[PDB]
Design a protein around this nucleic acid. Structure first.
Lengths: 117, 101, 138, 113, 155, 59
RNA sequence: GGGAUGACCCCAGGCGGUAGGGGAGCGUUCCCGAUGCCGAUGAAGGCCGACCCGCGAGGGCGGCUGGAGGUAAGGGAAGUG
RNA sequence: GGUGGAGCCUGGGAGUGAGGGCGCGAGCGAUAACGUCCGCGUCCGAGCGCGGGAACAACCGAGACCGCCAGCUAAGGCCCC
RNA sequence: CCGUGAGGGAAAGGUGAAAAGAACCCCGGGAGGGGAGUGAAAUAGAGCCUGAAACCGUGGGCUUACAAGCAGUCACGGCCCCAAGGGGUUGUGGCGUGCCUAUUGAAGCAUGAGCCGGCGACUCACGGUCGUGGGCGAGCUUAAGCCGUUGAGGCGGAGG
């Protein structure tokens, strides 16, 4: 018996055209400009997740530095402090203490330079 | 009050009423968990060294759940290499009850 | 997750002039201020920078022999359209341009990069024609 | 209420007549009529006749009151082109499409008391 | 095949400085008109199954059916002159209600005419005994003369 | 066909954008005094005509 | 390794990849299953879906169209993506 | 000593039979070449995936099953970008 | 239709149960509409079932005239639409050398490709040789045919 393509192709194609919503021009309309685009989109996302995880390490650091620069010392030194003090805690994420509750930050700094006389 | 608890190799600034999600805790669906894992307080506890000693924050596990699906796709050019991963991170939702140290 | 991320920052004005300062070693600091980078809300996509008023430009000292030696450059799109100007002459005219060029190059090159540059106000002087506060920084 | 017209298959390029349609969108029927009348474009004529038809409908069919009428919406969709053989040098032979229009005009009423 | 299609073999355009693609005849399988590639031809799906394996199957098929409690070989057929009416009545007395499907084998052509048109009964001469017809049916009913031949067909 | 040719099909974007200046201007009209009508200026037009001057037909 | 073998749980390794080798699936046409079952209280096909299951190929469910066909489990064949 | 995606044996299926750079050792060459020919090694090939090197197959770091808004390091870096 | 000719050689199916195929009025020169009317249905209205995509319009939301781009992606923020959650859009920030083929090596200024839809390529016969599911075993097995079936299976040992 004969098994013509039938319905099947139209569907692989509009599965993929759904994924292509909002791409510029033909990238959202062509069965296969969409396709191409989406490989690259896919890789971008994957690596870009990796990066997001480094992109924030970075952000935190820079406002940590900022704030502890406000009390004389700097980030190189400040981390030494926390390290020795045993408070591997901060976790650059959570030195948003820099902003909400600097009170608390102030202390942390003090404890930090105390490990260093 | 305040509290910086740690679970999943991740820390979080919790408070008397909220939490979000945080990775499989082997906890019965509706049970209680103490996150004795603990740093900080809202009247400056700090931690002399890492964990403030007999301090614990109680949270109530609301339930479990897979996160929203991510599509992980890999592609290599001029070498026919195409790959689909559907991924959903499961977690548990907690509600912070009290921070008792 | 915390979006620590701020709501419109009340920007700062600053008056600054170590008239006898090495440019660059000044300019480097200027820039840092221009991005809200000393401050602990640093937000990369936003411009919560300061406003920096340099007074008494000209005067800027500089090391070794960098007059007739530093050479500023302009290519007008034309044939033969490279121009080379010693620093001597930049001071000799447009001295307020010397400090600016040095700072520019140290700011990020995008659109925001450009927008922060306009938050830098440079006067060979002194006297700074906007009284709008000015915590003088030393 | 609104009244609609549509001239199917007009035989003039859509691209070409839109030109005059866009000249009268959102205009009293009074405006439009003057506008078409002195527009220097073959298409004005077909568009005049479709706009006039819709008015008849408005008034005669949905009792809509002439002085209140305006051009709510109007547009031209292409119909199926006629394909035609045009011979070139060196035996070459081209097909030429004679484009054909579906002009539509739809009137409504204005303001009040 | 491309070979069997009506179109001629003329080359369709030069091969060279056309500017179109290369081609021979319009009967090629990239051509709409053209031939199909490895399409079906007529062939024979028969093959010779080991006779012994057939005996086995046939023997077993009944056995499963015997084990089930479905094999009932009979003798009484007053349900004569093959009338569906007559058979049906007879069936009622034999507890053949038509609630399961039934395979009736017998050499008696009148009882054959009798069922047949019943839609829950599959009628069958004994030489036609065979696993498929056995299996497809829920219940198995044999003449004792039919059970005699079934005997012979094994051993 | 020969020597220069277009290199890429043109975007609908770049096409519709070239046509930015294609929109027509509405014909410039005014009212026929001595007659109830909208004509172009500086023109004798059969709604009326003129005064002591030539035109279509009127009693 | 358990072993109320549960294909369900602990313990330990590994899991870039072209030519290639192997292994498990998905889907299309047709056959038995069928004198059956679903279908006008709406089949096939089509247009949406931020919903559900699947690693994926896919499978559902919900609305809209459509207007008469479709076809389980478990097998079988191929003009099968 | 060494349980290793070690070895040995019998059989089914292959693809390859066009290499490239770098280091070291020779020949050719002019102690020329992103030269050319072998030898030992290594990587690219197939790791144009990740960090460094401004950019850059094969130099430095390091073998990418998936996820994290956690932590420690590698090369290389810490005046501004 | 093409070719002097031998010869070559297409395309093009489908209203609805029934034509009940739209009287009559309206705009128009007509073509086409709008009402009315038939029909279960007229976005079934006559190359009329279903009506996908490319392609072209109209309206609406978000958005853009000092920025530099394989067009995406990660992050924030704004505005828009049903709600402690989503959906749309994108301003700034970070990152980012199209797909396939061929190659030692391609974003490549090397090949192919306007785009969309359909058609389009590892098979079948008989031998062979491994493997595997089975049947019987020092045996195994039948071919052509003959009889029976009318989707029924038997017999047939020449032969291998």
């Amino acid at each position: 018996p004969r098994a013509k393509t039938g319905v099947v192709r139209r569907r692989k194609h509009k599965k993929i055209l759904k994924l292509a919503k909002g791409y510029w021009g033909l990238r959202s309309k062509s069965a296969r400009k969409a396709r191409e685009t989406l490989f690259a989109a896919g890789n971008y996302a994957y690596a870009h997740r990796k990066r997001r995880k480094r992109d924030f390490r970075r952000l935190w650091i820079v406002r940590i530095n900022a704030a502890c620069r406000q009390h004389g010392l700097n980030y190189s030194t400040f981390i030494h402090g926390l390290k020795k003090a045993g408070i591997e805690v901060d976790r650059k994420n959570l030195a948003d203490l820099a902003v909400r509750e600097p009170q608390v930050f102030a202390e942390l700094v003090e404890r930090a330079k105390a490990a260093q006389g | 009050m305040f509290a910086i608890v740690k679970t999943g190799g991740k820390q979080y600034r919790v408070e008397p009423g909220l939490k979000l999600r945080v990775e499989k805790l082997d906890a019965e669906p509706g049970a209680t968990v103490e996150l004795p894992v603990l740093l900080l307080g809202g009247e400056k506890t700090v931690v002399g060294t890492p964990v403030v000693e007999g301090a614990s924050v109680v949270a109530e596990v609301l339930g479990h759940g897979r996160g929203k699906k991510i599509l992980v796709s890999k592609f290599k050019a001029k070498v026919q290499y195409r790959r689909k991963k559907g991924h959903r991170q499961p977690y548990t939702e907690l509600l912070i009850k009290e921070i008792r140290g | 997750m915390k979006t620590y991320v701020p709501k419109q920052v009340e920007p700062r004005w600053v008056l600054i002039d170590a008239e006898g300062k090495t440019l660059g070693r000044l300019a480097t600091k200027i820039a840092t201020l221009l991005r809200g980078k000393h401050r602990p809300d640093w937000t990369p996509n936003v411009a919560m920078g300061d406003f920096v008023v340099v007074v008494n430009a000209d005067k800027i000292r500089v090391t070794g022999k960098k007059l007739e030696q530093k050479i500023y450059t302009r290519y007008s799109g034309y044939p033969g359209g490279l121009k080379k100007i010693p620093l001597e002459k930049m001071l000799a005219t447009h001295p307020e341009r010397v400090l600016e060029h040095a700072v520019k190059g140290m700011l990020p090159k995008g659109p925001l990069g450009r927008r922060l540059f306009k938050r830098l106000k440079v006067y060979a002087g002194p006297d700074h024609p906007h009284q709008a506060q000015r915590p003088e920084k030393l | 209420m609104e009244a609609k017209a549509i001239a199917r298959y007009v035989r003039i390029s859509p691209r070409k007549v839109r030109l005059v349609v866009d000249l009268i969108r959102g205009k009293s029927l009074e405006e439009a009529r003057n506008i078409l009348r002195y527009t220097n474009k073959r298409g004005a004529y077909f568009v005049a006749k479709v706009l006039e038809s819709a008015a008849a409908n408005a008034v005669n069919n949905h009792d809509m009151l002439e002085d209140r009428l305006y051009v709510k919406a109007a547009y031209v969709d292409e119909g199926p082109a006629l394909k035609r053989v045009l011979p070139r040098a060196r035996g070459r032979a081209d097909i030429i499409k004679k484009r054909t229009s579906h002009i539509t005009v739809i009137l409504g009423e204005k303001h009040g008391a | 095949t491309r070979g069997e299609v009506a179109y001629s073999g003329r080359k369709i355009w030069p091969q060279k400085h056309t500017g179109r693609a290369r081609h021979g005849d319009i009967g090629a399988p990239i051509f709409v008109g053209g031939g199909v590639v490895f399409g079906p031809k007529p062939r024979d799906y028969s093959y010779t199954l080991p006779k012994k394996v057939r005996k086995k199957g046939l023997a077993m098929a009944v056995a499963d059916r015997a084990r089930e409690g479905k094999l009932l070989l009979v003798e009484a057929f007053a349900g004569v002159n093959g009338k569906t009416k007559e058979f049906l009545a007879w069936a009622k007395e034999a507890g053949l209600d038509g609630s399961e499907s039934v395979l009736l084998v017998t050499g008696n052509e009148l009882v054959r005419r009798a069922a047949r048109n019943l839609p829950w009964v599959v009628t069958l001469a004994p030489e036609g005994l065979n696993v498929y017809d056995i299996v497809r049916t829920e219940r198995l009913v044999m003449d004792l003369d039919a059970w005699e031949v079934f005997q012979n067909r094994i051993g | 066909a020969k020597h220069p040719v277009p290199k890429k099909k043109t975007s609908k974007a770049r096409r519709d954008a070239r046509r930015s200046h294609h929109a027509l201007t509405p014909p410039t009209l005014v009212p026929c005094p001595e007659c109830k009508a909208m004509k172009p200026p500086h023109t004798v037009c059969p709604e009326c005509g003129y005064y002591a001057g030539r035109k279509v037909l009127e009693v």
